[PDB]
């Protein structure tokens, strides 16, 4: 409570503020091209993005 | 064009308390003064207008007199001030480049002051540990036995 | 001035691993250079016998009507 200081530690620069896009991790994420997904999350939709492999 | 040798060649010199070798040349024999390094040497000699190829036992003791005198206090012969060692010294406020056991005087006086008011830096000097924030779990085992 | 014998020139390339080098040999009078500078004026200095080598083993005489100049990238 007492909103003077509740979320006061500045969520800005730094990986405690960057998060996973899919369901809210903050570890191993991919900020490349502005995708914002953690490494585990990215593989499932892999094709769903469009990143096909060599084949 | 030093062809044979002169009749005088100082085998070893004697500058403040360290008998510097006469065998080495000028810029790399006065590095052996504990306080004058390899880069501070070249500033002094190029202020001194000496031969930077001659060797140490090959000049008169008026020539060595001019070299020591320039490095004795460097501020007053057009030498800049983020070049010296004791820049803005924390007991006097002065700028100096120190050459001798006085450098070792000002060395340990830094350490005991960190020990006397008990800063965290000095306890690591009172102990045999690494001071500048490294690990010690896996490195420097033969500090102790 | 394009009067006497224009456009008797071919442009021929050779490649090793990244280095494309294409010479525009004209008809002329024995003038060989690379990027402006000549072929005795080159930087590795131990390989003088391996870049004016086609002038060496074939000869200066047979190729004295040609004006080879080279660009390198």
């Amino acid at each position: 409570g007492h909103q003077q200081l509740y979320w006061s530690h500045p969520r800005k620069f730094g990986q405690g503020s960057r998060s996973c896009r899919v369901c809210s991790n903050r570890h191993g994420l991919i900020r490349k091209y502005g995708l914002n997904m953690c490494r585990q999350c990215f593989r499932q939709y892999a094709k769903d993005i469009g990143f096909i492999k060599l084949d | 064009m030093s062809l044979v040798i002169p009749e005088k060649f100082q085998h070893i010199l004697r500058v403040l308390n360290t008998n510097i070798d006469g065998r080495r040349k000028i810029a790399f024999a006065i590095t052996a003064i504990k306080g004058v390094g390899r880069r501070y040497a070249h500033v002094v000699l190029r202020k001194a207008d000496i031969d930077l190829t001659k060797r140490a036992g090959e000049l008169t003791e008026d020539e060595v007199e001019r070299v020591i005198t320039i490095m004795q206090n460097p501020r007053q012969y057009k030498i800049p001030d983020w070049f010296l060692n004791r820049q803005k010294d924390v007991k006097d406020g002065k700028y100096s480049q120190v050459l001798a056991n006085g450098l070792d005087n000002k060395l340990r006086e830094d350490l005991e002051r960190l020990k006397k008011i008990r800063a965290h830096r000095g306890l690591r000097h009172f102990w045999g540990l690494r001071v500048r924030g490294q690990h010690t779990k896996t490195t420097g085992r033969r500090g102790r036995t | 001035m394009p009067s006497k014998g224009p456009l008797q020139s071919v442009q021929v390339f050779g490649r090793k691993k990244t280095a494309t080098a294409v010479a525009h040999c004209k008809r002329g009078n024995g003038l060989i250079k690379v990027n402006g500078r000549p072929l005795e004026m080159i930087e590795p200095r131990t390989l003088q016998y391996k870049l004016l080598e086609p002038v060496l083993l074939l000869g200066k005489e047979r190729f004295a009507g040609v004006d080879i100049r080279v660009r390198v990238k």
Binding site: - | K88, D89, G93, I117, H120 | -
Partner: protein, 127 residues
């Protein structure tokens, strides 16, 4: 008369207290100067205000009461030279006396975070 041998940067403490904030960076070293270049925030005012409360209500020839604080980012400033601070370590409030020496350090240097090593003999490990 009533004298001891001392000198700090050609500037004795008898002219340190009557000296502005902005020219204390002319004395202080580089990292302390960047801190004073930037904003001493409100919790840094709040400690020195209680210190200004502590010096004035001092009994004679006597320490102020110790002040428990939790920051350990503060430059040791001349406005509380000679005061009794209490600085947090991880577990306790270590009781520290300020003095003329250390003006150029912080308040984490005087309340150690770890307790130093003592001993050691190999048990299961060190094969």
């Amino acid at each position: 008369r009533t004298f001891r041998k001392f000198t700090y940067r050609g500037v004795d403490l008898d002219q340190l207290l009557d000296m502005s904030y902005e020219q204390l960076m002319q004395l202080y070293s580089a990292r302390q100067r960047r801190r004073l270049n930037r904003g001493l925030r409100r919790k840094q005012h709040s400690l020195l205000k209680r210190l200004r409360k502590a010096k004035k209500e001092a009994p004679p020839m006597e320490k102020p009461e110790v002040v428990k604080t939790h920051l350990r980012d503060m430059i040791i400033l001349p406005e509380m030279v000679g005061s009794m601070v209490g600085v947090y370590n991880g577990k306790t409030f270590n009781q520290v006396e300020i003095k003329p020496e250390m003006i150029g350090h912080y308040l984490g240097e005087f309340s150690i975070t770890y307790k130093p090593v003592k001993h050691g003999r190999p048990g299961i490990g060190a094969t």
